[PDB]
Design a protein around this ligand. Structure first.
Ligand SMILES: *[C@@H]1O[C@H](CO)[C@@H](O[C@@H]2O[C@H](CO)[C@@H](O[C@@H]3O[C@H](CO)[C@@H](O)[C@H](O)[C@@H]3O)[C@H](O)[C@H]2NC(C)=O)[C@H](O)[C@H]1NC(C)=O
Ligand SMILES: *[C@@H]1O[C@H](CO)[C@@H](O)[C@H](O)[C@H]1NC(C)=O
Lengths: 214, 171, 217
């Protein structure tokens, strides 16, 4: 069975620069049925290149590919905002058909600080017995970010649940949500709840808070 | 009896696959007063100046009759083009073959996708085999060459056969 | 033209038999060279070819999926089916069908998520995330919608029935104790809220639930 290994496993790329992805086949077959697909996070894979070098119609010509034996190379140049995706090579030369492991391409952009918003438990959730405190940290860059939850000045580590969006295909930012889960009883013991965002864009954290007795 | 233009195909295959390219060439005379050529498909005008006509990516609808004319070389006899659907096609440059004339056949794949382990068959029997797709070329046709021909080859891990074509050796 | 749409059960219990259907248009499985294949992808993982069927009923199978796989086609109704037997949690993945040919895979379907689990189909609770009074004195105001305690994926979150799309962030769900929790944010001018209405529409097909919550102070 043919093993396809892609290098690099991940790449950060500047707007307009050439990006190269290598796919190495364990076996050589004399054009080889080597195909390339682009998969944007929410969607199916989409064919880019078929049979080593053939550009699929409707795909811009800044995608191209070439094969040098067991050495197959995808080239994107210039790279655009909308190329943030995972790229897969794939062989139809022999059963079973196999894919490469994927190369995750991400875009670089100017640093952007998160827009931070904090939200207390709603009444509905409180009546039902639970208490969730929600913090949004939207449209920032780079993706690295740290959230610190406080309850009346004391950091709370347990109960926090964090989720990041995939890179935005238009503006190359990221966003993140941070959700602190409590019960109604342990919530109504304390007054002030704080979301604290540490990011490259500031020496000082961004601090958003609310007081239950607002 | 008025002199006529003549159509030629490049390549000379008159049976082609969808997405193939075809160049049609017009042999005809010009004069300082007019150097234009007109092309007709199914008797409708498709081009009014250029000597050649290029089909970039053939569709089934490009099948049919083609004619050309110049002012001095009148409307050509038609040349027929067949655009077939499918993955594999046995191509021939003409319909009839006289004895001692060459027979040139090609096992043609869709978009010229690479073909391995290719057999050309006559009346059900393996006639010629290549590991890499080559043309079938009989240098001197004999009447024993008449028959039903098709070809078959391996595409990666799947064999495909073309449909049959009747090859008739005449005089 | 060519399109493919997969269908599954959303959720089935382990050791059961997964039934998948692929319905296609724009080509016919009677044409020489055409085939339909199945590929799967665990969340955040790579792609694994499972099986495909050719126009001549020749069927090829991943030799690692034992003999659990069975692919069939129906030329009359333009459909292809895949059966996986004896499923376990490692079979949870998005399942794609694709129109292929002997040299590449040409068109893929949208994919269908299949979760293999014994947990119970719980519909989501929806909670509004309303700004405080101080937040409204900024130029832009961010509102939200918390979708808690549902199972299995997926949910579909819209705002103002799709009229609000710029500046929406619907976050990936997180899995806790057989229950999923996602949130969704939307950002609008404070000159539009709470003057113009803003409501989120959550949908959970697996439980046939559809809910809307308006956002108020
Ligand atoms: C010029 O005239 C020729 C001769 O009438 C036309 O060729 C014919 O075109 C039709 C429509 O494309 C072909 O039928 C189609 O064939 C395929 C393949 O079997 C099938 O998938 C379709 O459903 C359809 O029936 C017909 O075979 C063909 N005749 C031939 C190739 O000898 C041509 O369309 C005309 N073109 C123009 C611009 O008028
Ligand atoms: C294709 O035909 C040849 C001749 O028998 C042989 O390699 C094989 O049986 C067929 N199938 C495949 C998948 O190669």
């Amino acid at each position: 069975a043919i093993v396809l290994t892609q290098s690099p496993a991940s790449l950060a790329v500047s707007l307009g620069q050439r990006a190269t992805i290598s796919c190495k086949a364990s076996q050589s077959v004399d054009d080889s049925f080597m195909n390339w697909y682009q998969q944007k996070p929410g969607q199916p894979p989409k064919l880019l290149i078929y049979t080593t070098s053939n550009l699929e119609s409707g795909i811009p010509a800044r995608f191209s590919a070439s094969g040098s034996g067991t050495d197959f190379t995808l080239n994107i140049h210039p790279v655009e905002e909308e190329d943030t995706a995972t790229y897969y090579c794939q062989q139809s030369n022999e059963d079973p058909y196999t894919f490469g492991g994927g190369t995750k391409l991400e875009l670089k952009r100017a640093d952007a600080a998160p827009t931070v918003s904090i939200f207390p438990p709603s009444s509905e959730q409180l009546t039902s017995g639970g208490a969730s405190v929600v913090c949004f940290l939207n449209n920032f860059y780079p993706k690295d970010i740290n959230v610190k939850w406080k309850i009346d000045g004391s950091e709370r580590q347990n109960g926090v649940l964090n989720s990041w969006t995939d890179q935005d295909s238009k503006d190359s930012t990221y966003s993140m949500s941070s959700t602190l889960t409590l019960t109604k009883d342990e919530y109504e013991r304390h007054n002030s709840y704080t979301c604290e965002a540490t990011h490259k864009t500031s020496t000082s954290p961004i601090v958003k808070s609310f007081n239950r007795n607002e | 009896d008025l002199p006529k233009a003549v159509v030629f195909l490049e390549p000379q295959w008159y049976r082609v696959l969808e997405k193939d390219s075809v160049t049609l060439k017009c042999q005809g005379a010009y004069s300082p007063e007019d150097q234009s050529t007109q092309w007709f498909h199914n008797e409708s005008l498709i081009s009014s100046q250029a000597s050649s006509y290029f089909i970039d990516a053939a569709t089934v609808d490009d099948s049919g009759e083609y004619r050309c004319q110049t002012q001095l070389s009148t409307l050509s006899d038609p040349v027929q083009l067949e655009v077939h659907i499918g993955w594999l096609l046995l191509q021939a440059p003409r319909w009839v073959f006289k004895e001692e004339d060459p027979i040139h056949l090609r096992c043609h794949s869709w978009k010229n996708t690479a073909l391995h382990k290719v057999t050309y068959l006559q009346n059900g029997k393996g006639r010629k085999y290549f590991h890499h797709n080559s043309d079938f070329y009989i240098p001197k046709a004999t009447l024993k060459d008449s028959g039903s021909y098709f070809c078959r080859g391996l595409f990666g891990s799947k064999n495909v056969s073309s449909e049959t074509v009747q090859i008739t050796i005449t005089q | 033209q060519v399109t493919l749409k997969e269908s599954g059960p959303g959720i089935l219990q382990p050791s059961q038999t997964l039934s998948l259907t692929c319905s296609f248009s724009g080509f016919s499985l009677r044409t020489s060279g055409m085939g339909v294949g199945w590929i799967r992808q665990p969340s955040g993982k790579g792609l694994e070819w499972l099986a495909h069927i050719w126009w001549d009923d020749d069927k090829r199978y991943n030799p690692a999926l034992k003999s659990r796989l069975t692919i069939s086609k129906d030329t009359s109704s333009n459909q292809v089916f895949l059966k996986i037997a004896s499923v376990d949690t490692a079979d949870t993945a998005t399942y794609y069908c694709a129109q292929i040919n002997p040299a590449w895979f040409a068109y893929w379907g949208q994919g269908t998520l299949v979760t293999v689990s014994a947990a119970k189909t719980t519909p989501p609770s929806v909670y509004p995330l309303a700004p405080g009074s101080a937040a409204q004195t900024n130029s832009m105001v961010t509102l939200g919608c918390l979708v808690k305690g549902y199972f299995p994926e997926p949910v579909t979150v819209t705002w103002n029935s799709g009229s609000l799309s710029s500046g929406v962030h619907t976050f990936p769900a997180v899995l806790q104790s057989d229950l999923y929790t996602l949130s969704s944010s939307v950002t609008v001018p404070s000159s539009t809220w709470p003057s113009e209405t803003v409501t989120c529409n959550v949908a959970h097909p697996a439980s046939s639930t559809k809910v809307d919550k308006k956002i108020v102070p």
